[PDB]
Amino acid sequence: EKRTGLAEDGAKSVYERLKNDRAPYETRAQNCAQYTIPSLFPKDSDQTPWQAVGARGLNNLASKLMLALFPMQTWMRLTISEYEAKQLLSDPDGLAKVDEGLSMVERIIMNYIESNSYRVTLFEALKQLVVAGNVLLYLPEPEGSNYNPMKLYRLSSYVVQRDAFGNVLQMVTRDQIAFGALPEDIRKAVEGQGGEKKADETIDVYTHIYLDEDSGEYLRYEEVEGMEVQGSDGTYPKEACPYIPIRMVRLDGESYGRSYIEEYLGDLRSLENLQEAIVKMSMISSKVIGLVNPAGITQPRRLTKAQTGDFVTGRPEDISFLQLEKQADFTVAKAVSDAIEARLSFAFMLNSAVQRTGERVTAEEIRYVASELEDTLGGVYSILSQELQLPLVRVLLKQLQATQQIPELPKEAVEPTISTGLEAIGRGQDLDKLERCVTAWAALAPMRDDPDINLAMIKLRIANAIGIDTSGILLTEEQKQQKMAQ
Amino acid sequence: QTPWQAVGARGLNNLASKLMLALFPMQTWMRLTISEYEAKQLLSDPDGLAKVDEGLSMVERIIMNYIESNSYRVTLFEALKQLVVAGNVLLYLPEPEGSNYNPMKLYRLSSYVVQRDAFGNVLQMVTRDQIAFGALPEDIRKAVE
Amino acid sequence: PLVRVLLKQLQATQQIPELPKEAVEPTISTGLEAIGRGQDLDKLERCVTA
Amino acid sequence: PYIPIRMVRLDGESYGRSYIEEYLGDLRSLENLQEAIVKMSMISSKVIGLVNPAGITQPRRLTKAQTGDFVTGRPEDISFLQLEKQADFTVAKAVSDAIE
Amino acid sequence: WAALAPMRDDPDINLAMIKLRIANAIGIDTSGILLTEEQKQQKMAQ
Amino acid sequence: ARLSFAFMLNSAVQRTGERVTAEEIRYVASELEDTLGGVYSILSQELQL
Amino acid sequence: PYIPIRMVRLDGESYGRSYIEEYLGDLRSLENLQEAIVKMSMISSKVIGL
């Protein structure tokens, strides 16, 4: 069947069209990668760098973020939905069974992420997210309990179109598979479409995903050499598309995202250009060249051949050694280079932005400057929890629930709330409030045996101000007199 | 074109980061409490009161759950940057509409306009989107040709 | 303004289960009050130390 | 549902002022200077030989020499072009730094 | 839990609930952390 | 020096510039731990499992 | 039982990148410089009478 809508005139033809507005982004990504790690986004179409600062910064930033966002620890938290949680009012037996299945679900997701090598690709994705605007993550249908890894498309080989509100209208990926590696059906279709193909010839395979105007849901198909692939068609519901295009830095009303490094590219290239001319300098400067005056007696052969300790026919007025003596010029260059590199280290939260060789670095300023690095990391992290973490989890839930790898739970826990960050680590806001109230209560120990002060009321008021539940914090009359008797 | 120095870049970035962690943290950040007038009514009625405070600090957690689930933090960040560099930002939050992914919309100063009265209340606004024809809704698309 | 609006939008779509009149127009604290490190707590535990 | 926000108010006016605007002077000053400084560092780090063509020392023979090599020439013919704007720099640096 | 030693002999504070709540926020199993009624009164007797 | 950070050589701490404090040693050492945790958490997925 | 391992993945590619590659520029630089310096030290240690 000929399909229409956004897929009216072929997948490849859409890819081609949308590529036009994507181009700036991939130029920008190519420039940033040039001065860090070029293999992330090479300057092929529309060699290593001199300095390694870009390289170790990017590597650092990714590592840090990946150990924050996706640690070996449990990192999401599923909890009962607010509405259904109001239902199980005065039903602890029926509740605590919900939370048991939810925290089971937690563990299943975790076991999946562990066993399908999600961490490794997430790393590569973070690098990409940092250097270029965007990554496209694709997680296929679980399909058994097999090794189901994730797939990553770097900005160069995929394309996106968003509406007014930033919702995804259509996507087109473009794999480049060698003919030999293609499935037989596809392989046969291709050569049956004319011209016999060599095993090492590469074949563009376009994958089109798009919103249908009629259905409130996505359609997908694969498309090779202008013809749709046999049984490559499919559909995805709007709220759970397994293709996730991620932006690092949003500009609303725009299909792709800006990148992190781009903001600090000015100072990065500046460093690169300088570090080059300095290294070259040092090379001229470490080269010894003698100068025998040919008007003199001292003959150069006789010098080169000499053993150490040797007396040789000559005068010292004939030989001189070519001195560079660009000694001051160097320290000006160095001072600048150093300044910039220092500025970059802060932007890559390298811990050795503390390392200043100027003065005796106190201990007290270290804590303050290290908390400027924590400040700016909290920034990217709290943005990448929304952008990368929550969508990845939300989609994994729906995917696993579809294949009944998630044993049936009671209605309450089908749409739970997904906590991430410090809550899940078990170091959250609730615990803090509780153990700040305990420390506030211990400060009325020097009046425990009160004359007429009434500890009960003050005890409850402290908890209220701080904001603990205080649902069964105070001992009731019947339970207190019961405990007074025993 | 990029700038020669990155002091401004890290400066703005710092400022926004700090502000956004202060204004919109993962913690609860608003607090809803009984109105002064109606609170005077429930004088000597604790049982009837702390039920109000119970439904309110429910409301808190609902708003919070929405802000978490609808990516409010990420757009607030971009808005704070905008707010610092250009004088003003425009936030648009559409009708919840089911229980779906309803994000917020941001209009930079360049693509919206405002007129205020004497007392500074809003009289009119006019935003200006710039959509590719292909992305438009079919009804509009067909009107346009 | 952000909060005030959300309240009115959520109460419109009855994504906010009905509460008794008192809590339809409440007062919206922000800042330190909410964090649980406010003026009230300070005054209390300054009175305990006195 | 449309909320137009201002950063810094000026009463009786539809739009708001910005935070950075207040400090723009010192910011553009910085940007002008750090430019002129960066460019300085590129001049200063560039080696350029000067072989006196009245002389004996021929430049082809200097560029082709290995390290350790002895070569026909006199050190009155080669000189390396020095920028020595060492003091002028630290003036510019002092000011840049003060602003930063 | 060692931080509520300066109020172990509580007047009307209820250690039981706060002890379980701390464990929940941290996120231990709490599957048989509290002493049950029959097992507690058994231990009080012995 | 730069390469020593990249190879997590402990003696990237060793700077002859200044009297190296005790408090910065810890902080710079944990840059090396940071970047080691990086390669390790990858190679655990790539090589170990 | 054949396990081919990659260090640094590039999705859609059969072989992996290396860890050192990312820092090779600074490494060859050192090698070149250290060579010219060691060679300097042999010229500097050599006594020749005239």
Author numbering:
A (entry chain B): 3 to 48, 55 to 494
B (entry chain A): 55 to 199
C (entry chain A): 399 to 448
D (entry chain A): 250 to 349
E (entry chain C): 449 to 494
F (entry chain C): 350 to 398
G (entry chain C): 250 to 299
Copy text from the publication:
Phage portal proteins are key viral components located in a single pentameric vertex of the capsid and they act as initiators of capsid assembly. They are also critical components of the DNA-packaging complex and are involved in tail assembly. Here we report a number of crystal and high-resolution cryo-electron microscopy (cryo-EM) structures of the T7 bacteriophage portal (gp8). The structures show two conformations—open and closed—of the portal and suggest a possible mechanism of the channel valve that regulates DNA passage.
Several X-ray data sets from various crystal forms of the T7 portal in its dodecameric (12mer) and tridecameric (13mer) forms were collected. Although the portal protein is always found as a dodecamer in virions, assemblies containing 11–13 subunits have been described for other portals when expressed under non-physiological conditions. The T7 portal structure was finally solved by combining cryo-EM and X-ray crystallography. An initial map of the tridecameric form of the gp8 protein at 5.8 Å resolution was obtained by cryo-EM (gp8-13merEM). The ring-shaped volume allowed the ab-initio building of a partial poly-alanine model composed mainly of α-helices, which contained 36% of the structure. This partial model was later used for phasing a 3.4 Å resolution gp8-13mer crystallographic data set by molecular replacement and a full atomic model was built into the resulting electron density map (gp8-13mercryst). A deep cleft separates the wing and crown domains, which are connected only by a hinge at G434 between strand β13 of the wing and helix α11 of the crown. This feature confers some freedom of movement to the crown domain around that point, which is also supported by the fact that monomers from the dodecameric and tridecameric structures are very similar, except for the relative position of the crown domain respect to the rest of the protein (root mean squared deviation (RMSD) 0.849 Å).
